[PDB]
Design a protein around this nucleic acid. Structure first.
Ligand SMILES: [Mg+2]
Ligand SMILES: [Mg+2]
Ligand SMILES: [Mg+2]
Ligand SMILES: [Mg+2]
Ligand SMILES: [Mg+2]
Ligand SMILES: [Mg+2]
Ligand SMILES: [Mg+2]
Ligand SMILES: [Mg+2]
Ligand SMILES: [Mg+2]
Ligand SMILES: [Mg+2]
Ligand SMILES: [Mg+2]
Ligand SMILES: [Mg+2]
Ligand SMILES: [Mg+2]
Ligand SMILES: [Mg+2]
Ligand SMILES: [Mg+2]
Ligand SMILES: [Mg+2]
Ligand SMILES: [Mg+2]
Ligand SMILES: [Mg+2]
Ligand SMILES: [Mg+2]
Ligand SMILES: [Mg+2]
Ligand SMILES: [Mg+2]
Ligand SMILES: [Mg+2]
Ligand SMILES: [Zn+2]
Lengths: 157, 205, 42, 115
RNA sequence: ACCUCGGAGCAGAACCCAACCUCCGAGCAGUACAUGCUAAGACUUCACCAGUCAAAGCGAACCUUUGAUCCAAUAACUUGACCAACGGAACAAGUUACCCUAGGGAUAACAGCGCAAUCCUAUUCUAGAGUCCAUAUCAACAAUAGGGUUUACGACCUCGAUGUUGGAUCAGGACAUCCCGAUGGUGCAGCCGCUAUUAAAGGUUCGUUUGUUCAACGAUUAAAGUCCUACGUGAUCUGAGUUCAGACCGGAGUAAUCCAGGUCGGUUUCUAUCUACUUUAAUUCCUCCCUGUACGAAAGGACAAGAGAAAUAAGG
RNA sequence: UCCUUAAAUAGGGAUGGCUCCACGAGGGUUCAGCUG
RNA sequence: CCGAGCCUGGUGAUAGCUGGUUGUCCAAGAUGAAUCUUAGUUCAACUUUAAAUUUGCCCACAGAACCCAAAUCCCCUUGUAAAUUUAACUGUUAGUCCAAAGAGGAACAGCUCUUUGGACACUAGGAAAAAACCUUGUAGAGAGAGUAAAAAAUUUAACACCCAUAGUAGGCCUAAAAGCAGCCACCAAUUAAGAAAGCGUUCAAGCUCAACACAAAAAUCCCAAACAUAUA
């Protein structure tokens, strides 16, 4: 047989032993190391500005709605000056401590839909929510004064 | 011309004189076209072999069909079939001289780049069909980017430097330690035990 | 399960495998010869 | 083809690590080798067979004393894969004529003048 | 076709190195007529033969391949014929199956054994077809495995009584399944097919032509499977093809003779010493019931289960 | 291509060229019969 | 027992061919040229014996070509004891496998050639059995000991989850082809989103990318038995 063959030629046993003896031995990296011990900034600045722009804030869970129903809700909210927002908890949890909102930590988890405004049409918004028996109002904080749902109802009335 | 150029079966002017089957042109590391040239991806030959015109057609058709002509361009990094393989008749008793030319073929050594791609496109976009073509190829082949090529090379030096085995094929062969040169080839002193016939053992330091 | 032809000579041979014992024997010889190199270097 | 093997000179250039490992001082190197044949010359080239015969290592495991000089070292380099080389150590110096008949080569490589 | 000599590579660097190996060239000419004579020392085509180089010296002047011996011819010096099968018989061709002897497995054919080019099978890739539809189905270029069923190759066993092919008899085995069994998918509504997985317990027809294996044809079948077994099996049989001595046709050859061709004819021995062996719970099909019910627009047409008939196989 | 068979690699027919009377343990094919 | 009878003789024909070639013991002993030649022989090489006298092998430095690698040759030392020559001479001399460089074949062959080396045609141990791989050789007895080569290893495919407003079916040609037959731009709103990345529509319609958000099979019958963890 030729030195070059289509198949892998059988090595002389001495050559095979040489290869086995000179096989690569990886180092042991000591104790097992595993077992051992600009849209983001755009959102940052936008939310920083929004926290001052808004005077009254609220939040809901507008995820159970359809595309068309959500569009209609947005239209009814834009009839007024209120604006509906959403932003990651991933970046909002830092925002609460950034803006000094300690009581707001256990309010934003999951889908959260902010309702930033300066003029309360919450009476009519709650009336609209009434004919859709779901999507309950969630607590908010107007001008650094935390309001529960009962607070929002009293403020509306 | 952002397309892979057609390769002829045989040279227009053939070789009147038959030449011997110098398998050394397949044996050992490739010294030519081992580096990227005006491209980002390519097919690396992890072993030696002979590229027939059928392989050339397979490569050309597959790549031309499965690349974007405007963005992706391709270039052959291997000459056209130029070595005649004088395959004899379809049955005859041995002797009578040497055979006649029936096919033409281009040798390829390990570490040789076969086809080189380029243009505005990232590696994973091309990995699929380059890997299919590599598998189609007659020798071990691999779809390799510039980054992956440099990464595997640097890994090879890392292995060569960090192995805890006191005994390396280079040391033993060069020093003729156990009289192993009675079993090795003179080419083994330079192949360093990483090449056996036309096969290349990348895993082996 | 037979190997065609005669064993250990043809193109197709019995697969031979290296035992840990064989590896140790070869390594022992290599160590002896590394010492030989050192003592022949002076 | 199979031929004689030319060992590159860098093989026979000891490093400080080797000096520590084997315990030989490059300065004031040892004078005499103790060479034993530990491998058969069968299945080895005729030139290795001839070198073994020259060095007088026909019998295996029979220590032989040789000069640590370049020519003997060249032959020993040719047949280094068949032999074990250890320096000859002389704790009490070379034997005197009085005790020439009371020496013994310890397995450590020391020729002791008391036995 | 070649046979002698030489140049280049194989054979890279002292020399040396083959081949039916890859290429090339030569059988001398031109010149002069010291291109004379002698002679140290050397080389050498692995022997010899032969072939090379050459200082000094003498003498004139001021060169770059083919062949022996004998034998002839010439007064001699010298010269010749072939010896190209080119180490050269002085002069001798075809043919033999009417053949013979000595041998050869160191050397062919069947067979065995290697090998796997060829062949066959399976996967990967989708080009692609598949009305679109890669993947129900099929498939190019290729890649990777596996097998040892063809056609070849090798010359390793056997040439110190084994023809070969078919057929008969009896079959052992593989499964890569032809039927029967169980499943998945379907370009499966049902029936049907197509495809794949699993399954080797059982089964797997009779005829015409042809020596035929095959093949075509006829009629069947549940099906008429692919293979291995010295293309199983001639100390069990047969000898139809082919093979020996006879003879024609056609062809080659001066003829003798010959022929991968066509045809008519043509001896098949063995009393068994040894091994081995000589008594190890069926299958299918059809009819009927279910039922012309399911399914289906209709056409068509089931499952599963059961009964009755046969047939075969085995045992009586 | 026709006949022969269910099926037909069989058989028969569409000096030279023919004519086969008879014969044949010659070589083929066939009806009918006969039969282990 | 007639492709040329039989008997006797020549005749013990001849045979480069086959077969055979009989006491004990020791020792040395192995792979080119020409040839009607490749089944033989002669010369060489090798080999044996005896003899003469004197270097022989190994061998670093120095040295050995231009054209266009492994190594080799040569020899001061040195390790060694052999070499040359003289006389006489048979026999072997168209080998095998393994490693390596090549050639041919098919980068087949237990295939055919050349070269370097090894082994076999010689002992023993091992690789199952075993000419050619590995260990090892010089010979005897021992009911001692240390070792050499020397035992195969491996088991391998889950997967984010979400849901997708609208400028408009972006235009062009295209019966319309709107993202999808195709070019060209590839902007844009809410907080946030490619005028198309894949199915599917003559064209639409219906679904997913994201982002929102959180390996294997062959023919007589498998083939030691077994064993995962007691100290190196
Ligand atoms: Mg065998
Ligand atoms: Mg000579
Ligand atoms: Mg001649
Ligand atoms: Mg001649
Ligand atoms: Mg041979
Ligand atoms: Mg016999
Ligand atoms: Mg099966
Ligand atoms: Mg066969
Ligand atoms: Mg006959
Ligand atoms: Mg005849
Ligand atoms: Mg005939
Ligand atoms: Mg006949
Ligand atoms: Mg007769
Ligand atoms: Mg008989
Ligand atoms: Mg009988
Ligand atoms: Mg008949
Ligand atoms: Mg008569
Ligand atoms: Mg008579
Ligand atoms: Mg005689
Ligand atoms: Mg002897
Ligand atoms: Mg002659
Ligand atoms: Mg002869
Ligand atoms: Zn841990």
């Amino acid at each position: 047989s030729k030195a070059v063959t289509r198949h892998r030629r059988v090595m002389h046993f001495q050559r095979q032993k040489l290869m086995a003896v000179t096989e690569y031995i990886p180092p042991k990296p000591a104790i097992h190391p595993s077992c051992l011990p600009g849209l983001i900034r755009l959102l940052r600045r936008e939310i920083a500005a929004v926290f001052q722009d808004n005077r009254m804030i609220a939040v809901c869970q507008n995820v159970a709605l359809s595309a068309e129903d959500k569009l209609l809700m947005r239209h009814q909210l834009r009839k007024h000056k209120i604006l509906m927002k959403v932003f990651p908890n991933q970046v909002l949890k830092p925002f609460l401590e950034d803006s000094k909102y300690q009581n707001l930590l256990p309010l934003f988890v999951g889908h959260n839909m902010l309702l930033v405004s300066e003029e309360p049409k919450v009476k009519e918004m709650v009336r609209i929510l009434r004919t859709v028996p779901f999507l309950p109002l969630l607590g908010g904080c107007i001008d650094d004064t935390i309001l529960s749902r009962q607070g929002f109802i009293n403020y509306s009335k | 011309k952002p397309k892979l150029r057609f390769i002829e079966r045989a040279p227009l002017v053939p070789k009147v004189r038959r030449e011997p089957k110098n398998l050394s042109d397949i044996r050992g590391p490739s010294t030519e076209a081992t580096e990227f040239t005006e491209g980002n991806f390519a097919i690396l030959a992890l072993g030696g072999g002979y590229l027939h015109w059928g392989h050339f057609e397979m490569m050309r058709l597959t790549i031309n069909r499965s690349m974007d002509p405007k963005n992706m361009f391709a270039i052959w990094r291997v000459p056209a079939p130029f070595k005649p393989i004088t395959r004899k008749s379809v049955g005859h008793r041995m002797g009578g001289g040497k055979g006649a030319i029936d096919h033409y073929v281009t040798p390829v050594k390990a570490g040789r780049l076969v086809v080189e791609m380029g243009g505005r496109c990232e590696f994973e976009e091309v990995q699929g069909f380059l890997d299919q073509v590599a598998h189609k190829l007659p020798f071990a082949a691999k779809a390799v980017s510039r980054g992956t090529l440099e990464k595997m090379r640097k890994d090879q030096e890392e292995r060569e430097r960090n192995n805890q085995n006191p005994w390396t094929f280079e040391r033993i062969a060069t020093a003729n330690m156990l009289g192993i040169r009675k079993v090795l080839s003179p080419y083994d002193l330079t192949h360093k035990g990483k090449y056996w016939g036309k096969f290349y053992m990348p895993k082996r330091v | 399960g037979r190997i065609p032809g005669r064993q250990w000579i043809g193109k197709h041979r019995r697969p031979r495998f290296v035992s840990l014992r064989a590896k140790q024997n070869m390594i022992r010889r290599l160590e002896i010869e590394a010492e030989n190199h050192y003592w022949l270097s002076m | 083809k199979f031929t004689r093997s030319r060992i590159p000179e860098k093989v026979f250039q000891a490093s400080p690590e080797d000096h520590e490992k084997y315990g030989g001082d490059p300065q004031n190197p040892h004078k005499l080798h103790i060479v034993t044949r530990i491998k058969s010359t069968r299945r080895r080239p005729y030139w290795e067979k001839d070198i073994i015969k020259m060095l007088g290592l026909e019998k295996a495991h029979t220590p032989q004393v040789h000069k640590n000089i370049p020519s003997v070292n060249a032959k020993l380099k040719v047949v280094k894969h068949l032999i074990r080389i250890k320096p000859l150590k002389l704790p009490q110096g070379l034997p005197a004529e009085e005790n020439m008949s009371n020496t013994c080569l310890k397995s450590t490589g020391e020729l002791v003048v008391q036995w």
